[PDB]
Design a protein around this ligand. Sequence first.
Ligand SMILES: O=c1[nH]c(=O)c2nn[nH]c2[nH]1
Ligand SMILES: O=c1[nH]c(=O)c2nn[nH]c2[nH]1
Ligand SMILES: O=c1[nH]c(=O)c2nn[nH]c2[nH]1
Ligand SMILES: O=c1[nH]c(=O)c2nn[nH]c2[nH]1
Ligand code: NA
Ligand code: NA
Ligand code: NA
Ligand code: NA
Lengths: 301, 301, 302, 302
Amino acid sequence: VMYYGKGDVFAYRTYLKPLTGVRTIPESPFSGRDHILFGVNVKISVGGTKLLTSFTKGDNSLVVATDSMKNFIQKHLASYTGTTIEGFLEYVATSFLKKYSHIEKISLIGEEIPFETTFAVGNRAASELVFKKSRNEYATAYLNMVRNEDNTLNITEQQSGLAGLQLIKVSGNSFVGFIRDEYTTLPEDSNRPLFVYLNIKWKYKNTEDSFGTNPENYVAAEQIRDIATSVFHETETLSIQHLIYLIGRRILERFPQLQEVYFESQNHTWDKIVEEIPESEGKVYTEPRPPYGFQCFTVTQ
Amino acid sequence: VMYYGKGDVFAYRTYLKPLTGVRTIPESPFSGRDHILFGVNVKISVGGTKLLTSFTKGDNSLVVATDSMKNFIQKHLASYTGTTIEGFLEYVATSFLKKYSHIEKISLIGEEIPFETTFAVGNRAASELVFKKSRNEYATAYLNMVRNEDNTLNITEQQSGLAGLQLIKVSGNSFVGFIRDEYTTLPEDSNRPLFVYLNIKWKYKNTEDSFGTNPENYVAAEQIRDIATSVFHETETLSIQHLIYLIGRRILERFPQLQEVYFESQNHTWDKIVEEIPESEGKVYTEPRPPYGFQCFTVTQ
Amino acid sequence: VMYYGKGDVFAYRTYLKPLTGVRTIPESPFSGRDHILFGVNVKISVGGTKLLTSFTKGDNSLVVATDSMKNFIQKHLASYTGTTIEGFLEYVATSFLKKYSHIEKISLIGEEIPFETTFAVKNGNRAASELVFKKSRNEYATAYLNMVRNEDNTLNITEQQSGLAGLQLIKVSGNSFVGFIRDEYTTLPEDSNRPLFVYLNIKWKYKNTEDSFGTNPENYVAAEQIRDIATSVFHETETLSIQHLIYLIGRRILERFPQLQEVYFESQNHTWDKIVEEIPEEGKVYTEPRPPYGFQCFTVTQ
Amino acid sequence: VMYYGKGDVFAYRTYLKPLTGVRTIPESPFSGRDHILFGVNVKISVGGTKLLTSFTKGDNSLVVATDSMKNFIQKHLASYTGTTIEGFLEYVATSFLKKYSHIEKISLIGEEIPFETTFAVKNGNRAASELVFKKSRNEYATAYLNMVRNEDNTLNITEQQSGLAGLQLIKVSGNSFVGFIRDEYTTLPEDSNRPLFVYLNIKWKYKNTEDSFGTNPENYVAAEQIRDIATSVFHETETLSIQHLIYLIGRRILERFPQLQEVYFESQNHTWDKIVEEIPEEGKVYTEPRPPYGFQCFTVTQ
Ligand SMILES: O=c1[nH]c(=O)c2nn[nH]c2[nH]1
Ligand SMILES: O=c1[nH]c(=O)c2nn[nH]c2[nH]1
Ligand SMILES: O=c1[nH]c(=O)c2nn[nH]c2[nH]1
Ligand SMILES: O=c1[nH]c(=O)c2nn[nH]c2[nH]1
Ligand code: NA
Ligand code: NA
Ligand code: NA
Ligand code: NA
């Protein structure tokens, strides 16, 4: 391995060109983003054989300073004329390889820094000025671009995602029928309040569709979130494994331009404390000990 | 000082009695809570002269185990027949002093663990089953109760609050006219994107009104949140100090049953990177260095 | 309430005057501080009735920008000629009130950012490095100071407190917790031998605030020495509870430092849950508990 | 991809077999581990094509509950008779594949939960305590292991890696960063003497996986010794960049441990910003930077 770069490059842009005309799906009201505020956290990694002596000899002649890479990203957010993080990553990548001929490979991660609307008043409406910083789920994007021997540039990998989704379904979930042996102490549960954390990532058949230039073909993280919550509600779940497969199948049915969906899920279900409350369908639970189950699974189109 | 207790007592209750009929205000749509899911993080502290020898002699005869205090709280969440955190704290407090005659003083903090609705589908609606765990703002409550010499119990202190509100207003804020001397390097800014964190706490004229038994008199954290966002939108702010005073005045005008409102605010405004973008009203900003300004201020009715 | 200020004012100073001339105790080899690297995180709060209209009218005329308070702290760390965080806070507070006549009260907190020595081979042998330090995320010293301006424009310290924060200690045996109340709320078993794991925050107040500054260092009480008393007493004691332990720690502190007026403890119980009791042919296995934690708050006075 | 498992499996063991018989190096006094207290955080991932219908059909017949995997790990820490995290992972992996025939692949990560010695006065003198330990939030050792079941039901290790995580080192002088590209994106000044602050994660692979287990301890490479090489080289070197430094650290590691095949570095730059350059009558003042951090990823091979 030989690469270097800059992490935690925060950049907030006001009044990015709005994303509009995204084809809708029945699980989600999403049709676009107003982009009054567009926040992103970028990580940039660059590589190339000509970087060797920066390591082996302490020669900085071909070192773009990581601080300069931060300036590059922030200046390019000011000049970007597109409408998505995926497209912003492409713009940065192409511009960086064009600028620095000694770099053979660039890898970028962009994480949305999400904001929510707030109420302002003779009637409450969404404010165009005041927004709430959200620490809940957020969109992500990843891009790798290389310079070939014939000096053409090529995207070698692209992936979009949704991170930090935390969903609890109070009833309508079972976990029964698993292996019972000398190591098993978990009771079977025919009705648990399954609490899952979800990170969902998708890849497109055609990299162009990720940029949003033709919004009809763009798959928004907001729509993925809404599919996940709908499928979870609809399904008598039999395990997290069962749930995530069904979510993936629905995503790929709604978005035929997608090639695959990948899931990283964790189980954070609470421990039950009070099983029966007189005169109520209610129950009391509490936080479990730290160990958490997880699942990782790809569904392909 | 001499007290002991239990912290991080998480307790999640399904199907608490709904809070309904809260008198509305124009800044907020809030009228109640369905309480399908009711999550709280409780801290309990107890004191009394009879605890001395548990410290000075290692005598545990009058030590209620902190683990038992956790069981007490979780069992009482199962039996609570009310509709608010404030009322739950009163129920726990009265029950604990009634149970343990050697305790002279109990202090409780309750923090909401908030959950948000999600979409499920032939039309999207809010799910009654699937909820999103939120890491954004949340309601709080605090209660202190004592046993008097004539053996009556009395609430000595009650306070409600909203914590973790993070609001950014992209324009319509200035900070000018402050002291310029040998220590001043901050440029005056006639139009900054003020980003404030807010913790807001209120006290009632009549402790009864905090419980929610008469919802007409209950002041919900959701309504406080919506007043804050409305006032921030409405105001050409001149500093955080100026903004929080105005928020407090509005709160006390809307809620005459309140005696005071207290604010703890922090300044997290971003540093500007790009001041002018051709053909746009947009700008680019980034995260500042760690130091943060803060303000603390009480407004009284 | 009405005040404002700046938090997370980090400041790192190289080559502060070393702390030496301290008075030793049996429980600690502490003999001073080299101060090649001195880091502090400062919070500053200021008040005064003349600040009212900055809130009620948006009048910034008497507002010292919080950014300027950060500059003030950082510049004064460069000029500070003393040897302790406590003395640094006094230097900042006195200087700030002298600069800003409309401020009536200042409150300061300083938290040490601790570094540990590393070793290097050079010129034939391994020795402590004067250049390379390891940042520590473990325990650290703290200080608190409040100062006021009186009607006659004199300045008085109104409260001072020192402390040690973030000490996490586990004793594998020699602790019991038995004899507590057993009623309809009790499910905790009696335990004659548990691996008690405590978090300790310990704070002390001096009889004479001058002794906190270090200008006569024999009278200073170092957080390092308090740390070492805590670990020694925990080892020495067949503990009957955390309450029992912290009282005995406090007694030892006050016996070793007669110039202290009191010591205050905030302790938390983070003891692990037992998984395996018997291992064939003296060990056991434990794991992390559920989140709820017991805590204790207790003062011992001289 | 298809796998599942359990994360944050904390396990604390008392009185593990001590590690001794290690081979020393000039840069480190490390001589073994007492193992009075041995803590580990384990993540376990398992796969196999027979798990498909647990996802596609909700059939739990071949699902080992993740809770049971936690039980498995905790119970095997009680029975483990070796002396290293690397050996513990092998013991767990081999045992798990032997128990569960439908599992084709297991991946394990173990992270040391480190504790430091404390001292106590007893029977007339201050000495290291055998009972009281301080939990550390600083650097810690790591291990990684992947094992597979072949068609003939033999088991093979397919990847092994050891490491040191969380090392944070600041060198106050004797570092430069000059000569980098100066163009329309450059605003960083050249600096002939900066207080370089690096975070280091260092990972190593052995030529022969057996040497990682500790059963012949003279061939084991301890994270403590790697830590001490890193601090020594940082002191010894007039650094020209972090890239320069980590290459030299890697060279020294590979020279001192010829049984290693390679060493991999993930470094981050957290150097403070300068506030005061000149202090009257050699110190300076620095403060925390904005969040963006440079990083480097680099392998040195034998
Ligand atoms: O959904 C689940 N999948 C699992 O693999 C599992 N293991 N324990 N609980 C579980 N729940
Ligand atoms: O609103 C503000 N109040 C302040 O006191 C301040 N100080 N710096 N910036 C500031 N902004
Ligand atoms: O030392 C202890 N003190 C307590 O009060 C307590 N309660 N549960 N366990 C405990 N341990
Ligand atoms: O050591 C460094 N390497 C780098 O690549 C770099 N970029 N900015 N500062 C730096 N320091
Ligand atoms: Na739709
Ligand atoms: Na209303
Ligand atoms: Na000395
Ligand atoms: Na030895």
